[PDB]
Every structure is written in C-alpha cells, then in structure tokens.
Amino acid sequence: GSEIVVAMYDFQATEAHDLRLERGQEYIILEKNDLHWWRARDKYGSEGYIPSNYVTGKKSNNLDQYD
C-alpha cells in the first residue's frame, strides 16, 4: 500500500526542501530513503522531505476488524 503517510506529529518547514508535518493530514508518500527522511506530498502540490518517523500508515494491523 502507498499514499498513506498519516502525519501524527507536528513539524515546521522554514526552508523549502523539507516539508512540515500537520497533525491530522494524511500525506501521500512519494519517495522513501531509509525509515527516517522520506519525501511525501502535503495537500495537492506541496511536497518535500518528511520524517516518516513522525508519520504513521494504517497503524500496523490494528484496524483489521476495525471494531
């Protein structure tokens, strides 16, 4: 599965290369590169280096049965 980089932690982008982390926004993973600094998309255009260590996918296999 892809495009499921759910941002849980907050981060501030002051440059441009690195993207910020918005708690609640489900980002779209574009590039990987190890487990730390990935490259994802914000909304509909903005992208950049995003520490996936601050994001989370489908939280492992928690919602298998959902409830």
We report the CATH number of the domain holding residue 62 as: 2.30.30.40
Domain that holds residue 67: 1-67
The structure was resolved experimentally with: NMR
Q: Where are any strands of DSSP class E within the chain? A: 5-7, 26-31, 37-41, 47-51, 55-56
CA distances from 42 to 6, 36, 47, 65 (A): 10, 17, 6, 29
| Whole-number Å distance between alpha carbons of 32 and 53 | 12
Cα–Cα nearest to 12, from 65, 66, 54, 67? 54
Overall domain count for the chain = 1
